[PDB]
Amino acid sequence: MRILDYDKVIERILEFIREKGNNGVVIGISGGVDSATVAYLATKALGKEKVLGLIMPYFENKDVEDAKLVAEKLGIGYKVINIKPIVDSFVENLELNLDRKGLGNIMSRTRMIMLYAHANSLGRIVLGTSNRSEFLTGYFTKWGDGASDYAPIINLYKTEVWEIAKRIGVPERIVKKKPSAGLWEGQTDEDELGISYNLLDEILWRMIDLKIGKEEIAKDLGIPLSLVERVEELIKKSEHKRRLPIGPSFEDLIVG
Amino acid sequence: MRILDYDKVIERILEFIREKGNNGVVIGISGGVDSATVAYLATKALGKEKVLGLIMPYFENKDVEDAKLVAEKLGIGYKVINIKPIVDSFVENLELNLDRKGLGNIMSRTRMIMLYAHANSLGRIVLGTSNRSEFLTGYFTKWGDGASDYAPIINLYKTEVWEIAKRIGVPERIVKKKPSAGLWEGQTDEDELGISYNLLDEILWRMIDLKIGKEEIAKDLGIPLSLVERVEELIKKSEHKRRLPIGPSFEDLIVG
Ligand SMILES: [Zn+2]
Ligand SMILES: [Zn+2]
Ligand SMILES: [Zn+2]
Ligand SMILES: [Zn+2]
Ligand SMILES: [Zn+2]
Ligand SMILES: [Zn+2]
């Protein structure tokens, strides 16, 4: 995988957060490693008084315990907000069936509204916790979690996020935890993507950053071309998630 | 001002819609001219059985009346969803003060969630109703109504939308009604932007499309260079609304 000079990378992230969130920030803390890493970097960069964490569970599971652990060890201000009543109200108003992915989308978008409502009230910005691995594969809710003012680790692959998390003191059981967006019980990132993040990042790195042909990738890693075509598919089918709403142009229709 | 070939613009928009939303569409109808125009274009392009209109009032005013009329004339399926209970619940969880714009943003984002919940359930796409005038001045809610799968008129200035609204047969009182985002009683676009759309568009077109200096612009018009800077102001401060969440880059830190 590409090699980064973490010492310098971490430094640049901290400087970036200092420059963008001097007036304080609001972050969604879920108990996963991405939001915890952003929570740690933001705290070290601005100091705990400038970091408000919102823990917004839908399910009452151990994930909440992990998030509070992050909040606790950092000493930041935080708030636990049960979003199930609001989420279910969206569903009751829908009056139609909705699969688990659609329901997960409501949860994530509901968290987005909560984050922005708090940031707006406090004159703060919202720090998103998405990473490049999710960004390139479309593994995120459009307009939901992820949607923020600034995203400190959007340009870092998952593998790198884990390395940085360990280096900054993020709880080990969190760093080692199996990745899960937590939209429904039993949801597992690698099972949904059908590949580990380690193997994914190796492909994205070569396919997007290096622009290395599908064939060179498969062999230059001893992996089935299928696995490579798969990844390339996730990227193509999620291109609509990496751009603002588009419409028709009318340049050749201008008159004079 | 720019001169467009309306008959052809409409034709292109209809083709765009027939291409992007063959499986049906969900549109937020608010009783304003933009959403009305998109509703008319979508209906004429796909047939009324492929257009679902969600009317989502927070206030109980005339606004809801115009929304229903648009839905009635088109014969499309429609659903009236009172969003106040959900919006007020967000506020209750907030437990902090929120000015009218912040509250207006909760409304807009709540409608976005409703729109995608129906779209997701019915396997349809969401058509945004923002226009270029709003887009360039940042006069919309981030992740709110400014969030959809496709925005058919986003590249048309407000003045051009009005013209198109008349040609496709949008109700006259709506086409003539004074522009308002309706996020708070008494709200007026022109009154809030400190300029009429007609003048605004003249400037935008010249300042952004033609890339003409504000100096000559103030000249070719007859308006104080201060009003011309006021627009340049609105544009620069809304740059954060015309892009996806960004984070720091690390190209120079990659050890290759
Ligand atoms: Zn490697
Ligand atoms: Zn109903
Ligand atoms: Zn994540
Ligand atoms: Zn793994
Ligand atoms: Zn509009
Ligand atoms: Zn006017």
From Swiss-Prot, chains A, B:
Q: Which GO terms describe its molecular function?
A: ATP binding; double-stranded DNA binding; glutaminase activity; metal ion binding; NAD+ synthase (glutamine-hydrolyzing) activity; NAD+ synthase activity
Residues annotated as binding deamido-NAD(+) = 109, 142, 149, 240-241
Role played = Catalyzes the ATP-dependent amidation of deamido-NAD to form NAD. Uses ammonia as a nitrogen source.
Q: Where does Mg(2+) bind?
A: 34, 134
- Give GO terms for biological process: DNA topological change; NAD biosynthetic process
What EC identifiers does the entry list? 6.3.1.5
Gene Ontology cellular-component terms listed: cytoplasm
**Residues the record lists as binding ATP:** 28-35, 129, 158, 180
Name the UniProt key words of this record, in alphabetical order. ATP-binding, Ligase, Magnesium, Metal-binding, NAD, Nucleotide-binding
The organism's superkingdom is given as Archaea
- Family membership, please give it: Belongs to the NAD synthetase family.
Q: How does it assemble?
A: Homodimer.
Named in its record, the pathway it takes part in is:
Cofactor biosynthesis; NAD(+) biosynthesis; NAD(+) from deamido-NAD(+) (ammonia route): step 1/1
* Record field: catalytic activity: deamido-NAD(+) + NH4(+) + ATP = AMP + diphosphate + NAD(+) + H(+)
- Metal-binding as a keyword of this entry, yes or no, is yes
Stored InterPro entries: NAD/GMP_synthase, NAD_synthase, NH(3)-dep_NAD(+)_synth, Rossmann-like_a/b/a_fold, SASP_alpha/beta-type_CS
> What's the protein name?
NH(3)-dependent NAD(+) synthetase
Xref: Pfam families: NAD_synthase (PF02540)
